[PDB]
Amino acid sequence: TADLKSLAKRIYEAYLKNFNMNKVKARVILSGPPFVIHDMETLCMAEKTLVAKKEAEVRIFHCCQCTSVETVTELTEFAKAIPGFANLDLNDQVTLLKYGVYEAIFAMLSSVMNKDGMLVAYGNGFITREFLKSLRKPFCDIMEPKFDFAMKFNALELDDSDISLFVAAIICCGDRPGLLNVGHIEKMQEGIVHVLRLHLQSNHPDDIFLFPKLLQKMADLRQLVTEHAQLVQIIKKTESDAALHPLLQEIYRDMY
Ligand SMILES: CCO[C@@H](Cc1ccc(OCCn2c(C)ccc2-c2ccc(SC)cc2)cc1)C(=O)O
Numbered sequence: 133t134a135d136l137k138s139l140a141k142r143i144y145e146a147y148l149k150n151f152n153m154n155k156v157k158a159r160v161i162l163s164g165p166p167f168v169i170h171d172m173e174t175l176c177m178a179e180k181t182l183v184a185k186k187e188a189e190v191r192i193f194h195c196c197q198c199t200s201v202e203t204v205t206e207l208t209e210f211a212k213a214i215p216g217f218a219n220l221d222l223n224d225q226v227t228l229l230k231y232g233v234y235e236a237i238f239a240m241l242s243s244v245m246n247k248d249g250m251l252v253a254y255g256n257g258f259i260t261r262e263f264l265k266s267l268r269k270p271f272c273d274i275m276e277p278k279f280d281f282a283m284k285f286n287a288l289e290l291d292d293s294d295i296s297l298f299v300a301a302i303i304c305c306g307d308r309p310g311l312l313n314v315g316h317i318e319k320m321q322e323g324i325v326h327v328l329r330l331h332l333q334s335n336h337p338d339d340i341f342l343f344p345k346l347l348q349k350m351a352d353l354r355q356l357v358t359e360h361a362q363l364v365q366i367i368k369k370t371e372s373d374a375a376l377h378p379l380l381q382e383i384y385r386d387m388y
Contacts, residue, residue, distance in 0.1 A: 144292065188267070235302045236303065248260060248261055332346070
């Protein structure tokens, strides 16, 4: 229905407008120039670009943090384009966002990642996968699971129009803890998922099973976030130099 066809465009619109990075321009950059960070020297050079006059692992740990806070803010504004979200109870908007933020972060970060590294610093830097592996434990275990997910997720060849609805569906999960009006959210969820399923059919006629694959990726993302939140706790509890942004701690607070 043209209403359905227009609903996807709505969400695709709010997506291109609230997220400073997207797959189309990330690929425009990844092709061909981002400053390559591939060893300790190039990391320190790139840092001096910002603070002219703690420990490499800990500085990286806070840079990623800065990207999460930004995306939390962007996701909230994006959520408005979903039919019914703004009509939901406030406490339920907070709960859906609290549990869907990191799932959406790691989903969208794939657009910026390839087998060799990922775009960082607003498209100005490119940090290598091998360098991230070379970091001392346990900071070297942060990103490699995100690359494994991203490599298989990107193999699905989704575009920003698909990821648009995928991220909306992520936020629209009816089985999040502490939801008051679970009934309305599931109806909200059913509407987003419906238009996602049909959009995938029309946009990817060469892969009719793309929708079941994305449902599986949704569950993979959930497990990916649970494990990531755990590793953050280990770093926070240990590594006495590793602070945790307070807005991010409130997201993890009572999550998994
Ligand atoms: C361990 C923290 O985990 C976060 C979740 C999370 C994990 C990886 C991520 O990729 C950010 C990109 N990147 C990496 C991989 C190293 C350094 C940067 C970087 C360099 C310069 C800048 S300039 C602002 C920004 C980022 C983004 C968020 C959380 O829990 O919030």
